[PDB]
Amino acid sequence: RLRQPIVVVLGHVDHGKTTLLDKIRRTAVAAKEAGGITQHIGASIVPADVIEKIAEPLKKVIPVKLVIPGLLFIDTPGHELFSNLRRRGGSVADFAILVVDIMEGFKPQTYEALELLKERRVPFLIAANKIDRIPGWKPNPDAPFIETIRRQDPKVREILEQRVYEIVGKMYEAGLPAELFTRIKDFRRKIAIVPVSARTGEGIPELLAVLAGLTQTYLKERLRYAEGPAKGVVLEVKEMQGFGTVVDAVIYDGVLKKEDIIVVGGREGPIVTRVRALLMPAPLQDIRSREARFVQVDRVYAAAGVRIAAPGLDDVIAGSPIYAAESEEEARKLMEAVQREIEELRFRTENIGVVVKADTLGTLEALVEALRRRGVPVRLADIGPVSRSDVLDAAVTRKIDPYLGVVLAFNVKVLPEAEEEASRAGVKIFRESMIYKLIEDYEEWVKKEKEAERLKALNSLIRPGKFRILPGYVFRRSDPAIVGVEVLGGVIRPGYPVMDSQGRELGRIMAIKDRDRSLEEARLGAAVAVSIQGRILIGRHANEGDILYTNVPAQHAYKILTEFKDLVSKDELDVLREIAEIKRRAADHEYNKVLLRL
Numbered sequence: 001r002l003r004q005p006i007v008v009v010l011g012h013v014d015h016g017k018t019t020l021l022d023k024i025r026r027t028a029v030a031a032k033e034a035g036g037i038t039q040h041i042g043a044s045i046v047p048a049d050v051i052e053k054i055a056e057p058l059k060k061v062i063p064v065k066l067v068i069p070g071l072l073f074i075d076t077p078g079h080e081l082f083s084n085l086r087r088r089g090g091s092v093a094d095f096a097i098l099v100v101d102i103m104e105g106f107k108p109q110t111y112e113a114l115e116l117l118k119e120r121r122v123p124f125l126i127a128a129n130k131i132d133r134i135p136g137w138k139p140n141p142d143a144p145f146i147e148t149i150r151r152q153d154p155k156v157r158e159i160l161e162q163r164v165y166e167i168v169g170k171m172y173e174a175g176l177p178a179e180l181f182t183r184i185k186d187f188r189r190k191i192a193i194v195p196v197s198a199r200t201g202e203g204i205p206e207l208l209a210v211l212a213g214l215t216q217t218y219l220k221e222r223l224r225y226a227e228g229p230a231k232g233v234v235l236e237v238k239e240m241q242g243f244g245t246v247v248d249a250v251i252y253d254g255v256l257k258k259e260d261i262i263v264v265g266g267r268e269g270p271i272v273t274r275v276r277a278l279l280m281p282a283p284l285q286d287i288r289s290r291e292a293r294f295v296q297v298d299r300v301y302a303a304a305g306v307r308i309a310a311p312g313l314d315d316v317i318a319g320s321p322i323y324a325a326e327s328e329e330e331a332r333k334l335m336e337a338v339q340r341e342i343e344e345l346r347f348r349t350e351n352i353g354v355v356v357k358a359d360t361l362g363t364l365e366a367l368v369e370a371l372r373r374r375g376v377p378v379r380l381a382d383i384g385p386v387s388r389s390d391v392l393d394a395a396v397t398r399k400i401d402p403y404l405g406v407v408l409a410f411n412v413k414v415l416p417e418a419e420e421e422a423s424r425a426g427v428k429i430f431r432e433s434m435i436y437k438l439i440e441d442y443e444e445w446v447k448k449e450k451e452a453e454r455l456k457a458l459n460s461l462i463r464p465g466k467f468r469i470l471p472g473y474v475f476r477r478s479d480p481a482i483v484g485v486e487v488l489g490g491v492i493r494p495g496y497p498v499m500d501s502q503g504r505e506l507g508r509i510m511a512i513k514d515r516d517r518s519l520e521e522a523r524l525g526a527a528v529a530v531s532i533q534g535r536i537l538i539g540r541h542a543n544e545g546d547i548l549y550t551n552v553p554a555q556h557a558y559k560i561l562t563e564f565k566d567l568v569s570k571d572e573l574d575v576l577r578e579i580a581e582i583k584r585r586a587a588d589h590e591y592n593k594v595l596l597r598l
């Protein structure tokens with residue numbers, strides 16, 4: 001027999017994940033029928049008969065005969081939750097809905113979702129949400145998409161088609177063929193796009209029918225229920241009045257019972273305890289449920305969202321496995337299974353790599369997997385605040401490869417000891433609370449650090465520079481000449497030889513100064529005071545308003561154009577072209593040879 005597919009909801013903030021979950025629940029509850037729907041902790045069921053009923057208006061186009069008993073929707077949406085809905089080597093979710101706001105299209109978290117989905121090989125569909133916000137939309141509440149779209153004005157349907165294509169485009173670009181669900185023949189070959197309104201209920205019938213069809217067709221083996229002790233995962237650890245520290249878990253195989261011995265992953269190792277109570281929300285029909293109310297149950301079966309009361313759960317961490325054990329002997333075996341699972345996620349090595357700290361097992365796993373996907377070695381991965389030890393581990397890495405010698409801290413504090421050491425060691429600590437942002441911030445830094453290293457090689461050379469002596473800013477006429485200039489292109493640095501617009505040598509830059517400070521460099525648009533050491537006498541060899549150039553050696557011009565061409569500014573290249581031409585007209589020997597060479 002089959003059990004319920006477990007469905008998770010992803011997508012960018014405010015694209016409507018929460019509204020969509022709530023609308024699905026309400027629609028199910030309204031569609032039921034006679035007796036209420038079985039209530040779960042952190043999750044809502046849509047039974048088989050309710051889906052078939054909701055699907056009835058589709059009878060002609062998309063029929064639905066169900067062999068799954070229903071769908072379990074996880075009621076906490078988003079990507080941290082999804083990452084904590086985990087088991088060894090994969091997800092506990094069986095299907096995802098990726099919500100995209102049809103009016104906005106893909107946003108940064110939409111790409112995060114796609115990565116998380118391929119990484120853990122979770123199948124999905126796209127819910128193109130907020131269709132009711134299309135200008136001129138005339139809602140038909142709760143109606144199938146296929147019916148309401150035919151009751152819109154031609155311009156409204158045009159916009160919808162345009163906005164769906166925006167999604168289609170991004171998907172093909174990402175390597176994932178996707179189409180409006182109506183146009184798909186082979187649902188193995190193409191991801192379904194279902195336009196919906198979490199607000200009006202439009203398209204909810206096809207959403208559910210497509211979910212049901214895709215899960216029952218392709219996931220039969222994964223969905224098979226085997227009788228035996230519970231396997232599950234902990235999503236949340238918290239206080240509950242009258243029960244102490246409880247865990248909220250999803251059971252994905254077997255049966256969990258009151259009095260069962262459980263083994264659950266904790267900060268200090270596998271915890272062995274015994275279930276005192278299994279809590280579920282009270283039935284909604286019950287008159288005492290106006291009060292937010294819980295009832296104890298004897299048992300729950302996969303798939304279930306359940307709250308577990310048992311002593312000693314304080315040290316549990318989100319994303320930990322939880323197993324029922326039939327005997328002490330079985331619990332001892334399960335302790336080793338748990339510890340081996342936890343060691344894959346929390347580890348330390350002598351490898352040259354980044355230091356990863358996070359707050360839950362799920363996000364720690366997803367962070368490590370994202371780095372691995374990109375080829376970034378990971379020295380250690382663990383739970384909790386960034387400590388002095390973490391910084392010193394990244395310092396070991398830093399000495400070998402500075403681009404890897406960092407701490408990536410996901411939603412954890414950094415201790416003052418660690419702040420102090422990072423400063424002394426030159427180790428950067430990255431702090432963020434969204435995974436893609438942590439990763440992007442690190443990658444961006446790496447790009448800029450690598451660019452800085454190339455620029456060192458370029459600054460071995462006298463670079464192209466062009467600047468005008470400002471009328472009214474001659475501070476000193478000679479020995480050294482000191483003049484206000486505007487940089488018209490390229491760059492000037494202390495030590496650069498300079499020449500006039502005819503290529504005659506005037507001297508060399510002794511100093512470049514702001515109104516505030518001495519500068520190592522000045523670039524396009526800078527107005528600075530340049531001290532020039534040499535024979536230069538202002539009024540004689542150059543005048544106010546005259547344009548001066550750096551005297552780039554021929555060999556240096558060659559290397560800029562053949563090794564650093566992509567790195568210098570367009571304006572820097574413009575100036576080198578001016579310089580090469582000044583040199584050409586002067587009949588400069590070495591420039592003539594380098595230009596022929598080029």
Ligand SMILES: Nc1nc2c(ncn2[C@@H]2O[C@H](COP(=O)(O)OP(=O)(O)O)[C@@H](O)[C@H]2O)c(=O)[nH]1
Nearest residue numbers: 012013014015016017018019129130197198199
């Ligand atoms: N007009 C319209 N608004 C929506 C729809 N779905 C969500 N919203 C609104 O968009 C906002 C964000 O929704 P929410 O479910 O919190 O997005 P989440 O951050 O992805 O969980 C809220 O104001 C919702 O009422 C929809 O289909 N149509």
